[PDB]
Amino acid sequence: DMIKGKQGRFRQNLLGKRVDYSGRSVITVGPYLRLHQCGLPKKMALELFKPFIYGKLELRGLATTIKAAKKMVEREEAVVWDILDEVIREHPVLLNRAPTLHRLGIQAFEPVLIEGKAIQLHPLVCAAYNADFDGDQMAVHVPLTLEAQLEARALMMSTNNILSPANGEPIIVPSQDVVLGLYYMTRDCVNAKGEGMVLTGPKEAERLYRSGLASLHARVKVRITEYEKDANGELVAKTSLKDTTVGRAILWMIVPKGLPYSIVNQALGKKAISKMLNTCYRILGLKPTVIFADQIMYTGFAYAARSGASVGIDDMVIPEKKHEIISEAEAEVAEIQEQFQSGLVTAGERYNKVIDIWAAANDRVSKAMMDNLQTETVINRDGQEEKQVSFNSIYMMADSGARGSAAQIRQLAGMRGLMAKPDGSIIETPITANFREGLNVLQYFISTHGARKGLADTALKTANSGYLTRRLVDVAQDLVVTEDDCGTHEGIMMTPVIEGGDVKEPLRDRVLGRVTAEDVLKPGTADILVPRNTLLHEQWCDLLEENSVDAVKVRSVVSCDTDFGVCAHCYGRDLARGHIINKGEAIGVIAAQSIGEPGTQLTMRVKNK
Amino acid sequence: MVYSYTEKKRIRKDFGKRPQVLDVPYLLSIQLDSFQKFIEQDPEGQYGLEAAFRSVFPIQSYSGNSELQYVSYRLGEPVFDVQECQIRGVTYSAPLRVKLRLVIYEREAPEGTVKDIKEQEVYMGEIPLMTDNGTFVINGTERVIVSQLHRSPGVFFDSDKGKTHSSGKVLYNARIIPYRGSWLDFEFDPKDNLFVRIDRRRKLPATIILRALNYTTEQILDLFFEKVIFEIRDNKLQMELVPERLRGETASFDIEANGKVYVEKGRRITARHIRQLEKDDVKLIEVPVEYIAGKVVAKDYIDESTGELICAANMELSLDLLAKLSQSGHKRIETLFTNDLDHGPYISETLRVDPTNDRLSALVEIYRMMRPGEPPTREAAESLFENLFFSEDRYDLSAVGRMKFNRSLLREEIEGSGILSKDDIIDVMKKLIDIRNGKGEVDDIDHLGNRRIRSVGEMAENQFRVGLVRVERAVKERLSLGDLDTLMPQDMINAKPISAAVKEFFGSSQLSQFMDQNNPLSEITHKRRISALGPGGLTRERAGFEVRDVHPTHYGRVCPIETPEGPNIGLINSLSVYAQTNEYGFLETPYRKVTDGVVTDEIHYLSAIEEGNYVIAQANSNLDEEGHFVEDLVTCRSKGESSLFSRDQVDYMDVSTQQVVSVGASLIPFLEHDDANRALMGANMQRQAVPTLRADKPLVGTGMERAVAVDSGVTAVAKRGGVVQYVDASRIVIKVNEDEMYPGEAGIDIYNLTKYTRSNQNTCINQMPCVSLGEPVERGDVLADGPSTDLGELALGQNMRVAFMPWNGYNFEDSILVSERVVQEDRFTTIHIQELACVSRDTKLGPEEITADIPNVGEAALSKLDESGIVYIGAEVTGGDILVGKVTPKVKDSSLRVPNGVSGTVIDVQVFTRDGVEKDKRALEIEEMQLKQAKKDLSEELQILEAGLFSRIRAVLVAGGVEAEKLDKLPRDRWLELGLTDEEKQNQLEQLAEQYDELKHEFEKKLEAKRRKITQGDDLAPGVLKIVKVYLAVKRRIQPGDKMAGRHGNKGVISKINPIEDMPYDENGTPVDIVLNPLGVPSRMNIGQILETHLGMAAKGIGDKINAMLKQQQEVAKLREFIQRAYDLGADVRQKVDLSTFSDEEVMRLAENLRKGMPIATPVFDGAKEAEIKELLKLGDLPTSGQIRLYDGRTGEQFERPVTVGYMYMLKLNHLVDDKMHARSTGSYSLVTQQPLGGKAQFGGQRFGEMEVWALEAYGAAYTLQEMLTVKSDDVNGRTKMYKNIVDGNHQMEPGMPESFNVLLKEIRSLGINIELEDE
RNA sequence: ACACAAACGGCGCGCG
DNA sequence: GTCCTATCGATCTTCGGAAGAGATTCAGA
DNA sequence: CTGAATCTCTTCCCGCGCGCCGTAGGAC
Ligand SMILES: [Mg+2]
Ligand SMILES: [Zn+2]
């Protein structure tokens, strides 16, 4: 028993063990923190570094002996804090949430000291950690030796880990609040205070807004300068005049050089910000990106507060058609039931026709509800009135992509809609009521079936998925990239998934980052467009799709002829580095974890020319 | 409308519309009734200890024709009261004592008594009395026993889908589950043969039992199969056709009669064809003889002409067999009517499988299976078989079990024997066959009707009976062995086994819960909780989604929302507000009757099986005040399905909209608007709430606040109609109206408030007064508030001033922003109490003692102690400070010190000792002090008692022995001295003096008894013979990381404290208390919270305008008009008040209470609508939108456009950061494995989880990992050397080798395996 | 003599 | 009361679940 | 030596917080 199973030595002790110089704390968000920084409480810090403190004290010579040093620390005297600051001056530290999803689940930080007891985390990072501040705890560990410190700083440090390893894509995309404030800022108003002036540049734009003589999203003409990096990368400037809203100009000041102004000259939802930041990094590199992220984070909070982006019950405008469509639909359903009483239709046909009537009714409600809210703003511009996208709180939150979805608003403003038993059978009458007006008892009771089912599935799924991952990690762990080339000229061929008729994925995304197995045949015949083992990075992939390619042959890890391992060229690009992998890396765990995290999100319960 | 004095101080404004008839039933009814029913010595034979005994007794021995027979029991009063028992830290047990008759009947004669003796009240029992609040007091503990949901005793019918042996077949299952004893199961084999198995033992053919039940094959066939017949009628064996049996058939030959053909080969048969066939007398038809051969014979047959028997029932026919029986002279051959689907051959199928033939073989065979590899014996087999299902002592169906069973078989008679019988088995068997033949329907185990609730009383009794069974073995042997002429019953029965059984049951059973005393609501919801776990139930992992998911029958019976998070989901459930339990233990709910056209106030309770028959309208459905539904048709659930039905076409209506939810959900206002997910969270968080020091009340209420507080029992109640005269914040005493003053009674009632005392969750429960001397009270009025209560209104948290908006990211995510004002305002300051105790041991190197002469410890700590070595009450201490100066020889400071990292104040000393132990000065004074306190209460009680006794003397002194000039100056005991004969005055003086002495004696003996109890020591555990208990009080403010929750599932942690200047503030110069993240609202879909804040904001405004007038000297007329207009506002609300009547004095008193803010009620599903809210805002001082502009406290500039500003009720959860934050740099290590200790209680280190190692592995870092396990976890040598190097500033590690690895190697090597390390 | 300190294994309830 | 001493293993409130592959196992072929 | 219908010892997210609680039989 002591050996076998979950309680066995292997799991109990060997593959996981309690460690000194560790602590756990409750989490909090520190907006002031820079991305590389983390805030921790003095109390924990004082404990954690006692051996370090003693050394400095005896290096100071203030403590005659270890016991004396320990004795002084009990005082918590000012000098202790002075030494503690010196000790902690740059020492990296490790923070991990539990259970970890992936290697991003653990990252290194530089500490700052706090009077309270919670541990403070940068908001942008926590999202990657999947932290929700409803009470989440977190564990801290300190690397002791020189080698670990460099290891922690070189790899784990947050600045290194902007890219997801499951996909070479930024995991840092801003928060709900940060994105919304910018979204509100980047929106435009047809007419506004101070509208219609000409500004030399952002400098006066900020001043004019700060003085309140012009509104943030008021329309304005501006002069601006922007930089292009030449064929080699040398950045040269151009100046031009633009028509824009004021908020865009001020935000441009935060934008570093080398990025076209057009990307920001538009309303910026999470969609736009996601690709803007992603492209920015590739064009400019990492170092500007990390600092660029912080300024984005600071700005978003500041003007989100100024916006006063509150939400109120009055904001939830209800379409009058809701009653009309409901009454209209109800009449038709009654006809279907009567026709069944007439014998004109079977019960199943009677049933399914009714739900179709409801489906049309609900959608028409969605049409009316959604169309009204977005349309809800009529404004005067130098006389006469015009329509523009509504500044409604609810619409902005969903439209910005910060939170929710069209379904949520449809329930709240429209109807909770059709609903089903635990068996999945749809109740032959939907939940016609919205939430702005209360449910009826039975309607609410019906909803309980769905809600609990969702919780039930989650509970067992989370347990089942973990046991799956354990199986994955064990088998995968053995594989390691050790060779540069295995020698094969063979490979597999890649295509876009062609199902449900035409494609449902682009071949561009899949071939990216791989290596050819044979030279690419150029459009036409006998001409070769790419070498036989070219690292298929972005431009060539763009070049290929520019051509009439349908499929291409690439080397694969499975085809890799390596002994006791894998060859780098077969693996190609590293998701977390962009460039080809460094030799000596155990990919197997990475792949296992990559699959493991998303698995939790699953569930356990002629057409054209 | 009129109100009580307690009600007439905060008349909570209401908006509910429905004038519900039925009041909220008493909450704890289930528990109290359960135990009361169990504990009573009910003369009737059902339920309670009496029933258990009658089940067991009489108990007899074959040996001497001797028995001991049962007589009823006596129950003794408890040794100590609740608090004395609690203080002493023991179980609040009562003793059981019984009478029984022990007899010896005569041998060789009619069994008259040689000797019989009735027991001298043998005692063996200690059972915990259900405390007043329905809890049970255990040793130093208070516990709650939850109610268990278990599969009811009855017969079940089930089918499998897809699991049917992969064949795509349908498999049918039938099970009989007794109330007690062996399981019995019947099953349809994939090969369609019917098999039986006992207690999940190996498969057997059902027919074996039939033989065991002494039935022949022909009898078996007659029971199960209808006959089909052929007869020699002028030619070969014409068939006795019954045309109806041709249903769905196609003829294979000519079917003809009366010169008319009705069917021919290949032609189908139908009903109209059948009508002609029988109508035309087709009773005989010569089927082609080969068709006869296809059938199977229904009987065994003889060749009577030769006295020979050659034919077997179940034998399939052949043409020669037709000749053989005809050769035997038989006029008829009988065969078993069958159809390929309508009438299956399953019994015949089984008969072919069955190897057994006779009852001997059946009895032998079954015994063999029950007794594998054991000697059979015919009578042994029979007796064993009898035990299986035909003796209560091994198989028993309770009254409910039999009733349930009879209901299943569609018996109109529900009564029956507790044991089974042949017919009962046959009926069940046939039903399963009926289902197989497509003429039966399966049950739904999840349907409530199949499920019943067990309560404390029921479970305890069964546990009690089990103990008797273990007595049975002992007593029987003793009785068999005993001489019986000098042995007496106390010898025959010994307590130990029985006491243990109940004793261990309470302390160990999963259903026994260490009560979540967190807060008043936590207890009550915890007490009415339903669990599926435990014996006879499922297990937290073995539960399919279907069982977990809410079932339609749950409506109005089990709250669908309350189920707690985690694996408990769907397993743990709470009763509805109006829930009730049937005598059978079925959860039942009341409904109103649709009497013809009018719904009527008559109410009837139904179980789900009853509800299926009728149609029931929604509670909120409109009606015309006569009973007729305003709409001619209404929405109703008939068989759980939702459909609309006409007035007088519907049958019943639900009494109350709140009927669907439990109390925990009920407290959430505007629930109808909010999504279930958040709602569920809110309910659980309620019990998570911790009281606050400055607790006042909820503003936006639901209407449960008064009821919950009263039924909780934490508040004091007026037991009699009375007026108040005393206050000390420790006791309250009431003078009672004459109509409730009893003829030989004082006429006064006194109560003692419970003060600061650690809860089960380390929180104080001190009660507070809410009254004044001379103040009147009705019976049942609220006398004293308890934790989280005011005026008997449940008050968990605080009404905060809040707005929704982003604020510099500090409120991103659930993060909650907080103002320094709130902490200064004490809103969420809270008090915690911790207990620390020390024991003195019989250490073999010399026993321990408490002393101030601690070795080498500093003077300052010693100063904190007294000369007894004990810290003083009221002291203030910090981590490491000495509390108990206990020491060990060889002397040593084996003393108790404050835990590291905590500071608190000291209030308690309780000292205990074994018998034969000397006391100290501290204990003596405390013990004497408590004695004095009891005496003081007794004296004051005596003072009124004698005062009433004096009143009798003084009254007659008005007319006889008149001495009013010096009335009481002649002492009131000297009043007797009058030199009088039997005269009226003397008779009063002389007789009442005897009563005066008895009264004096009662206090004396009560006084003596009290101090004697207080004086005595305790039966401490061995190895220690004196104990001291110390309590420590901690006051806690709010810090970043504390967990905060709003009722609408909006939980979040707070992280900031701001200079009050920074907070956004309104044009009226008022800052907000809190700021919340707005983006959560659409994500959570709990808009109701916003409705709360809007309403609360309006409620505050009403109070403010009231406050301004009261702050001014506005005359009462203004106050009268303003308040009355406030209450009358709204739609057709149910509530009303008549302020004009209240003397203009209670108006001020009532009005003063209002100036804090208007308290409002909001029925769960009949709350106020927006239009009403808009009017209130207009009646207030705010726009109908409720949103306001605000200004940045940092810059003084206005925020863009209005924002939501409102007043919300907010709760503090018992999870504040300091109680969870933990850190360790260095510390001890475990012996069995050198890895660090674990957890917070011990100074353990964090566990580096297995998965997290993988994450580390994902990165290329290796040195970190090496250091992680070697240095930091599992290498004594390395970590010590590392320790020095750090002092040396090298920060370098030596590789080492994990010690635990050696442990594994040893263990493996300790196996039969040889394992080694290889150098090369 | 310049030095150790109080957990082994279960159960229930909650937590993200 | 304290303290010594020898096994420990039957009949009672038991059943409360279930996917997946190596024996052993049902029906002849 | 073919066949299913029979057959039983593996496994059941990672961590955390209290509370309780552990051989039988006997000199009387
Ligand atoms: Mg969380
Ligand atoms: Zn390769």
**Strand E: positions under 7 A of a protein C-beta atom:** 5-7, 10-22
Residue A551, H or E segment: none
* Residue A560 in marked binding region: yes
CA–CA min distance A258, chain B (Å): 29
> Which residues contact residue B275 at a Cβ distance below 8 angstroms, ignoring those fewer than 6 apart?
none
Nearest to B346 by CA among B231, B174, B175, B183: B174
Cα separation, B978 vs B181, whole angstroms: 78
> Which residues contact residue B979 at a Cβ distance below 8 angstroms, ignoring those fewer than 6 apart?
none
For residue A228, the cross-strand partners are A236
B837, two tokens: 């105790």
Residue B1211, H or E segment: strand B1203-1212
Cα separation, B993 vs B978, whole angstroms: 13
Q: Which residue's entry shows tokens 């609508």?
A: B1169
Q: Is the CB of residue B1035 less than 8 Å from the CB of residue B829?
A: yes
Cβ contacts of B426-429, under 8 Å, gap ≥ 24:
B426/B223, B428/B155, B428/B174, B428/B176, B428/B186, B429/B174, B429/B186, B429/B194, B429/B206, B429/B224
Cα separation, A548 vs A564, whole angstroms: 39
Q: Is the CB of residue B378 less than 8 Å from the CB of residue B367?
A: no
Cα separation, B663 vs B529, whole angstroms: 11
CA–CA min distance A605, chain B (Å): 8
Cα separation, A568 vs A574, whole angstroms: 10
Which residues crowd ion ligand 2, with CB under 5 Å?
Answer: A 486, 560, 567, 570
CATH 2.40.270.10 fits B657-713+789-828+1037-1220, yes or no: yes
Cα separation, B945 vs B933, whole angstroms: 18
CB-nearest to A435 from B620, B1085, B1258 is B1085
Q: Which CATH architecture has domain B153-225+344-444?
A: Alpha-Beta Complex (3.90)
Resolution in A: 4.2
DSSP helix/strand/coil, B155: strand
Contacts of A102 in chain B (CB under 8 A): 1255, 1258
Cβ of B995 under 8 Å from any chain A Cβ?
no
DSSP, res B805:
-
- Breakpoints of chain B, after residues (C–N > 2.5 Å): 890
Cβ of A394 under 8 Å from any chain B Cβ?
yes
Nearest to A307 by CA among B121, B1110, B1064, B371: B1064
Contacts of B673 in chain A (CB under 8 A): 435-439
Nucleotide nearest to A139 (CA to C1'): E15
> Which residues contact residue B601 at a Cβ distance below 8 angstroms, ignoring those fewer than 6 apart?
B21, B592
CA-based torsion, B13, B15, B20, B25: positive or negative = negative
A118, two tokens: 């919670």
Where do runs of H (alpha helix) occur along A263-346? 270-284, 286-307, 321-341
DSSP helix/strand/coil, B700: strand
Q: b vs e for B457-495, b when ≥16 Cβ sit within 10 Å of the residue's Cβ?
A: bbbbbebbbbbbeebeeebbebbeebebeeeebeebbeb
CATH 3.40.50.920 fits B918-1017, yes or no: no
For residue B931, the cross-strand partners are none
Phi-psi region of B151 (alpha: psi -120 to 50; beta: other; left: phi over 0): beta
Rounded distance in angstroms from the CA atom of residue A138 to the C1' atom of nucleotide D19: 37
Domain B829-917+1018-1036 in the same topology as domain B576-656: no
How many angstroms is it from B1035 CA to the middle of ligand 1? 27
| Distance between start and end Cα atoms, chain B | 98
CATH, range B714-788: 2.40.50.100
Cα separation, B1022 vs B107, whole angstroms: 51
Q: Is the CB of residue B732 less than 8 Å from the CB of residue B751?
A: yes
Interstrand relation of A481-483 and A566-567 (parallel, antiparallel or unpaired): parallel
**What are the extents of the domains in chain B?**
26-152+445-575, 153-225+344-444, 226-343, 576-656, 657-713+789-828+1037-1220, 714-788, 829-917+1018-1036, 918-1017, 1235-1320
The CATH homologous superfamily of the domain defined by B576-656? DNA-directed RNA polymerase, beta subunit, external 1 domain (2.30.150.10)
Rounded distance in angstroms from the CA atom of residue A542 to the C1' atom of nucleotide D27: 68
DSSP, res B268:
B
| Distance between start and end Cα atoms, chain A | 67
> Which residues contact residue B688 at a Cβ distance below 8 angstroms, ignoring those fewer than 6 apart?
B518, B522, B1045, B1211, B1213, B1214, B1215
Q: Which residue's entry shows tokens 């969702």?
A: A454
Rounded distance in angstroms from the CA atom of residue B846 to the C1' atom of nucleotide D3: 19
Cα separation, B1224 vs B1182, whole angstroms: 54
Radius of gyration of chain B (CA): 41
Nucleotide nearest to B508 (CA to C1'): C11
Nearest to B705 by CA among B658, B667, B657, B665: B667
B915 CB and strand E closer than 7 A: no
Phi–psi pair at A168, nearest 5 degrees: -70, 70
Interstrand relation of B580-581 and B587-595 (parallel, antiparallel or unpaired): antiparallel
DSSP B1266-1307: HHHHIIIII-HHHHHHHHHHHHHT---------HHHHHHHHH
> Which residues contact residue A567 at a Cβ distance below 8 angstroms, ignoring those fewer than 6 apart?
A481, A482, A483, A484, A485, A486, A560, A561
DSSP, res B100:
E
Q: Which residue's entry shows tokens 């809600």?
A: A451
Residue A129, H or E segment: helix A123-129
Contacts of B565 in chain A (CB under 8 A): 455
Q: Where are the beta strands (DSSP E) in B1116-1257?
A: 1187-1188, 1203-1212, 1222-1224, 1247-1248
* Residue A541 in marked binding region: no
Cα separation, B248 vs B267, whole angstroms: 11
* Residue A243 in marked binding region: no
DSSP helix/strand/coil, B540: coil
How many Cα neighbours within 13 Å face the side chain of B792? 26
> Which residues contact residue A338 at a Cβ distance below 8 angstroms, ignoring those fewer than 6 apart?
none
**Strand D: positions under 7 A of a protein C-beta atom:** 2, 11-17, 19
Alpha-carbon distances, residue B607 vs B531, B578, B582, B994 (angstroms): 19, 13, 8, 60
Cβ of A178 under 8 Å from any chain B Cβ?
yes
Residue A262, H or E segment: none
Q: Which fold has domain B829-917+1018-1036?
A: OB fold (Dihydrolipoamide Acetyltransferase, E2P) (2.40.50)
Phi–psi pair at B1009, nearest 5 degrees: -60, -45
Nucleotide nearest to B762 (CA to C1'): E18
Cα separation, B226 vs B336, whole angstroms: 6
Cα separation, B1245 vs A24, whole angstroms: 9
Residue B1207, H or E segment: strand B1203-1212
B1317, two tokens: 């390390």
Cβ of A419 under 8 Å from any chain B Cβ?
no
Contacts of A400 in chain B (CB under 8 A): none
Q: Is the CB of residue A289 less than 8 Å from the CB of residue A280?
A: yes
Q: Which residue's entry shows tokens 């205070």?
A: A193
Q: Is the CB of residue A87 less than 8 Å from the CB of residue A49?
A: yes
Radius of gyration of chain A (CA): 30
In Å, how far from its chain's centre is CA B994? 52
For residue B1027, the cross-strand partners are B839, B912
Interface of A with B in 351-390 (CB under 8 A): none
How many Cα neighbours within 13 Å face the side chain of B89? 14
